[PDB]
Amino acid sequence: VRSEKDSMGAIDVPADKLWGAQTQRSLEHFRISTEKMPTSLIHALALTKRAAAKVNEDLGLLSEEKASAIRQAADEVLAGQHDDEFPLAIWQTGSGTQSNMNMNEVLANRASELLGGVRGMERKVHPNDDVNKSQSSNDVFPTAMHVAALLALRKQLIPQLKTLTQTLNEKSRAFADIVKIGRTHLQDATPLTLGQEISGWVAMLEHNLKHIEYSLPHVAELALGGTAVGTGLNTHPEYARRVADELAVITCAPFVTAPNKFEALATCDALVQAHGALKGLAASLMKIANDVRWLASGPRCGIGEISIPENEPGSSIMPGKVNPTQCEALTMLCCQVMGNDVAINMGGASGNFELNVFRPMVIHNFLQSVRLLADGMESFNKHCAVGIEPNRERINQLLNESLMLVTALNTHIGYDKAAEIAKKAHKEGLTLKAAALALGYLSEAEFDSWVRPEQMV
Amino acid sequence: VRSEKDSMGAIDVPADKLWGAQTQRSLEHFRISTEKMPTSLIHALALTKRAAAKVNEDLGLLSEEKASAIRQAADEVLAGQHDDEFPLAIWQTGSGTQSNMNMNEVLANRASELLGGVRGMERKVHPNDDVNKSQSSNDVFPTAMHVAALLALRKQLIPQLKTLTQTLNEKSRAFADIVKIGRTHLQDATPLTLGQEISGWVAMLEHNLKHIEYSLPHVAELALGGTAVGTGLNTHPEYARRVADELAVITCAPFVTAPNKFEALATCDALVQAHGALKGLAASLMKIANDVRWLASGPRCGIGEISIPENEPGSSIMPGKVNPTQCEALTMLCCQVMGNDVAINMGGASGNFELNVFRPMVIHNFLQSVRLLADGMESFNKHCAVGIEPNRERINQLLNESLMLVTALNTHIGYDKAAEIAKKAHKEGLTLKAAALALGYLSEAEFDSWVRPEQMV
Amino acid sequence: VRSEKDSMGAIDVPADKLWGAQTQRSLEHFRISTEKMPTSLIHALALTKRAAAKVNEDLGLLSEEKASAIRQAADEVLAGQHDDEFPLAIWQTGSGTQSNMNMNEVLANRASELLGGVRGMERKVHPNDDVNKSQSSNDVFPTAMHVAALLALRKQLIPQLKTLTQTLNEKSRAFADIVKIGRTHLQDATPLTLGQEISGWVAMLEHNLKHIEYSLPHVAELALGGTAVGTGLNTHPEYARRVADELAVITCAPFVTAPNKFEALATCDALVQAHGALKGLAASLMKIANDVRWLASGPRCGIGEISIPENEPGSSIMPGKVNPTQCEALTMLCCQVMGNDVAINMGGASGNFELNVFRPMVIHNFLQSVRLLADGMESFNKHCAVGIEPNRERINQLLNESLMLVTALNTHIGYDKAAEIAKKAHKEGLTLKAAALALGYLSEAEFDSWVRPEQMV
Amino acid sequence: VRSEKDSMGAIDVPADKLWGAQTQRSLEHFRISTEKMPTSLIHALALTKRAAAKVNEDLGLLSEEKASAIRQAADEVLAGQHDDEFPLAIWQTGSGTQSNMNMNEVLANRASELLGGVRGMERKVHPNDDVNKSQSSNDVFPTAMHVAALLALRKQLIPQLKTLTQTLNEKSRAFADIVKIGRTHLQDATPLTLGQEISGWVAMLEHNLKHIEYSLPHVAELALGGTAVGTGLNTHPEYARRVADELAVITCAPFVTAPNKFEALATCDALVQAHGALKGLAASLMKIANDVRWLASGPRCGIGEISIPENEPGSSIMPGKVNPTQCEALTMLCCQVMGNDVAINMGGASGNFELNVFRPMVIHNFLQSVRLLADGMESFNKHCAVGIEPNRERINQLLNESLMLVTALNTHIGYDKAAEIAKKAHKEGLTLKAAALALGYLSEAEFDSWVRPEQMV
């Protein structure tokens, strides 16, 4: 152990840990469930502390060595060597006060070691005085939240979306000439090509990308600089703009300071809205994933128009039986995003006065949705999408058995003659040709020259 | 017109209307959307005013004629002749104050006419003084809410549920001997009978009934008697128990006075919980309705194991094409109940101190869900369920084409021989028999005596 | 009555009605609940039939008189004289087939009367043959859905939003100089002006407008032209673009034909996404409405920093008691939009193959949300927002009683002296001045010159 | 490493791990997010494998040593020494096939070591042949799901609920004599005692317990015995009842075999319904937690009627400022449960035919809700509830400042005189007494003897 100290007194802290007293004490008051802060949030919080250090130094508010050590300590968190120094549960103070201190304490104890070498009360860097300089838990957590979200969106989900789109766009191109029977209300309908159907999946993904991109500008607005209530009391007038510019410099993302800090602190609106676009993508992905599994159902008693890769071990006595596992993982996580959206909306609508204190819950759900969506699309693409192949013989079989093509005959034989063979064929269990020949309305050769599915699109 | 008067002054009211000034004034302040109070709520509100009149009279708090006229006026509302006297939107005061007055005013003006004959300021019955005697908008609306819900549950939804159950139970009984191929993950699986599958739908409906019944006792608790904050200030000690007994006498439902009026006024918990059972039934109905439509998909390119009644006009050129319209109405309303549940939960969790003021919205959603569920099951039963018929030839065809029966051979020929024909059959596109015969492992007669689907359940 | 006839036969229809047989028959098969198509959807459906007539005529597909009469009949629906000719419930066929026919039949019977004069089987205009020419229930309903939504958004909700924003922006401007104590976690915090707080409400509304506007382009895409499965079988190549241009000409909205008809028919993605922006606005409105009611709570035992207009009749014995009725209507409808979003998401994710058959439910929820939001903001603005007034004396009282201003003393007397008076004041129940004077650290005059709330923002 | 082997071939597995090939391979196909199976599910899965072993042995289906070693290996999982042997993500095959195998493999390799000693291909116990004997992933996962849920409900959540109830019931008893002003619509209302208000919180918790208990019987029904599709093909007729009895013997819970295995496999109805009761408790907890934070707001500019324990370190310059941290953690997790309910409902309504394949997601949400609820109530009780204390002087102050007591004067001086002092007092900013004395209607002594808040309940 090691006795660390805060305004309430001294408390025992594991010697091999970098956190201080406040983190240790919160660890006892909030022993709820098992959800902790996500790594991406922790790194976004480190990035925030680093940019803040750099700006403070620029404004002569922090000495060269003090600032340089905090930033250097931050890079270690980013390097991933302090993942185990953040034990706090998601279910803490609604402002994310604890996790802010947790970062301040780990960064203070470590920056101290990077200078003199005291981890503990005799440290050279103060968590509150130096690490948390020109800030507040009120404006730091919201900033970390936006940094984590924008970056997760820009380099984790969007790349995977564009990738799924390209694979499906190529599959669409390759199967452009394969005509199949359409289905409306789950009933046989007018034919269309396999590529046309898949092109629908592609159009959907392109539309979604568009909707996700419109929600980025609002998420790119940072609260850092509004301090406690948004007035920005006790901070350099240039601090807000400066910290935003620095964060943008290092992340290469379009971060800007929020034009209205009161809106930035009082709400989680940017994320409520951004998640609206995500549940939209989940509804799209659910339909695409559903189409795939149904299209691949069988091998004998389903639809079986396409085949997908069999990734899980099977049985020799069970040839052709392939459970659509990737489709099941994607549909399941799509339900999660829908649920997460309700949690986010309830927390986002519950702000009071100057601050919204439902933040840890909101970012937990939001980050999880991006993670699920991005990884789900990656897994779906790699283990399923690239392997979509048409069962051409099965597709032809179905096409020739349906009555939906009887429309192509009308231009030669009126509705009367056409509807005649479709009635008998259906009653006797005959195909359009079989029935047409028996009713002597035309020959096989004429049938085969009149019913051209490739011409009815 | 007719100038009616309230504490804010006099206001013009349509001469041919029975409502007073307060209703007229609210009509101008809450012009939001088009949702009004449901007829069932209005009748439950009338029943409440009637029972209150009867108890007041019993406690010598209201004269024989005054009480008798209010009750007689109430019966007219119940008789359905005053449906047009309640113009108020759902989006009013969260306590349902307006609609309470709306009832007080219509019942005062009418009870007046049932005595002397003055509809207006010179009326013989006072809305507040006589009609709203020993009550408050705070405890009257919650009572009307519970009266409307319990009754809608007991004689509108439960009867329809039991009816759907019986139809499906009989269909289950009739198809007990029809063996079909099962489907897990949408892939062909081990066989089961059609009656067994349908018995699953029945077990689900019986379970749901059970869950709906457990939520009734809490909804049967009435708030009437707690007045403004639950203390029951200014009401006869026997009033609460007496009004509950009277309501139970006339509705034949097990109404009782709420043991804790503070919980009764501060929350909508009974309905939040009751609606939990309703969204449960919706998830069950959605699955049953989905099974039906998929099982009936076709006529040629789907599953087509069963046929359902064609209720909508079709085309001669489109024989066998039957859209599962009832399944589409039921699945759509099941989504609505899910949505309604979220609205209900948000309002139910938003109570503050002594009173929950999200009531008009809560009962609007709850009543709509019961209405949708009860009517949906009635329509589904009548126009679909009773008409479920098996396409026996299609079912056999699928059964004999699948490879899932190769298991029945193992008890004669080892896994090695069995898996051999299943591999070839699948590869060459042959049935188990066809492949088995070609591999000379057994004869057609032996195959037909070994693979008995009626014995593998 | 009047015997109308369809492919299933003849059926009795009320003589005084304009609808035909199919509408009459659906009226019996879908007797579910009481929700019917909203007037805005019906008018959007009429606008669609009108533009389709005009384009058909342009392509020599419909004679001058036939086309002119259908359009003229459509304008009557738009003029609002046929509101009672659409009895169909929302809970019908998922494609909205019935309501499409309902429009075809009313427009056929009426256009007939506008020519010769036969309402019924001997009519001069055929619902299917002339009214439903070059269309399908599959592509007509989705078009009507988008027409109704975009127009409701552009001229019903956005105008009300901008209006609420301007009122609040002016209230913000007027109270810019009124300093009040801030509240974080519901605890007293650093001060800010009333105008700054309200400016937060304004920034939120401006952001929302921005988010709603980004969702319009996708909703402006029309499916009309894709026919049954999206291939656009049996329609003039120029039909799609032409009908879109015409609809844009008459509505003055930026309608365009959907680049991908398969996405347009297979999903309700545009509305799932658009509603995402609406639930975002509801979360914002809920917070603003909550701030108002809490800020106006009292008159004696709450916060009471502002007063709002008393629109409902009160009691002389209850002076100052004003229930925040508008805030209760707005918060209630905000919960509804949240619920509606879940219904919309479930239906939007349930599309199968070529068509989504959850449409009537989706547009019912979407249209209701716009209606609730637009009307709610109108009612809130008019009956509450414009009347927001600060209780300046109450605000000063609270400001001078709080300990939050002790920070302003530090620049004269160190933390030691400052924290001393804040400790005693809190313990003894004294103000900062009262305690400061007793501890002889400074004079009243010095206190009154050092603690300037107007300088700590 | 160590080369393990399955039907797809051999694969490299970490030598220091107990899992086999299938687990290793799934680990690569389902790299989605970071959610893994909860410890409680894993232990419920171990309990299932143990009871299955014991029954197999009883039916002479598994040798003494084979059975004894599997059970002994299971107890080690229960002892918590194999927590790190289950790497699988929640986002896997919808039936939970992988995690079932993951358990089979770890239990096979370990039971082998408990006999001869071969961890790997030359092991003495076969995962599929011995560990997964008389079972299927289809009926084993649903059983583990119900075992985990019932036990978490019975010994984790209910105990915490009853504990919170008792604390609040005692606080209610202790403050029974403390009269305070009520609040309806957030406006001052008729008075009630603090104990009466808190008794409302208690009544709510007692009601919830009741609702949670009604959902247990359905969750106590186990699917184990229905095998693949529910027919129970290839299992001892007594197997189902026997395994249920054994599980009940060891867990001491009322487990029984599901009367209908088709309903048990095709749906997650029991959990959809059980979670309905949980979101009900969350709406109740949200209100209680909200009442507390608002009641404790201040120290100067809020309500401040009660004080709560300050558990987080503060500032000397900030005396009396105590953020309601426990209330913020509880309200946040209540939003989560609401969200989780939507995820659960969507998955529960998406079952197809013989099996629901949304199970891993459903149990993940359900288990998390119980965990959050149970731990939240424990933390809230311990760190907040037991410390609720009334600010008696603040409560009196508010009581004497309000106009709500003017009603008590009417029985001496008519409405005219009473409403007179309430009007002036409100206008001049005087209390009822102050105004009453100035208007010479009565003396201070008479006022102090007529306005008795302890008598108006």
Swiss-Prot record, chains A, B, C, D:
Spell out the catalytic residues: 185, 315
> Which InterPro entries does this one have?
Fum_hydII (IPR005677), Fumarase/histidase_N (IPR024083), Fumarase_C_C (IPR018951), Fumarate_lyase_CS (IPR020557), Fumarate_lyase_fam (IPR000362), Fumarate_lyase_N (IPR022761), L-Aspartase-like (IPR008948)
Q: In which pathway does it act?
A: Carbohydrate metabolism; tricarboxylic acid cycle; (S)-malate from fumarate: step 1/1
Effect recorded for residue 123 to A = 10-fold decrease of fumarase activity
Result when mutating residue 185 to N: 200-fold decrease of fumarase activity
Identify the SUPFAM superfamilies for this entry. Answer: L-aspartase-like (SSF48557)
Listed under GO cellular component are: cytoplasm
Phenotype upon knockout is: Cells lacking this gene show an increase of biofilm formation.
What is known about temperature dependence?
A: Thermostable.
Q: Which Pfam families match?
A: FumaraseC_C (PF10415), Lyase_1 (PF00206)
Reactions catalysed according to its record: (S)-malate = fumarate + H2O
Q: Where is this site: Important for catalytic activity?
A: 328
Activity across pH: Optimum pH is 8.
Q: What induces it?
A: Under conditions of iron limitation and oxidative stress.
Q: What else is known?
A: There are 2 substrate-binding sites: the catalytic A site, and the non-catalytic B site that may play a role in the transfer of substrate or product between the active site and the solvent. Alternatively, the B site may bind allosteric effectors.
Subunit and interaction comment = Homotetramer.
Protein name, per record: Fumarate hydratase class II
Q: Which species does the entry assign this protein to?
A: Escherichia coli (strain K12)
Q: Which gene encodes it?
A: fumC
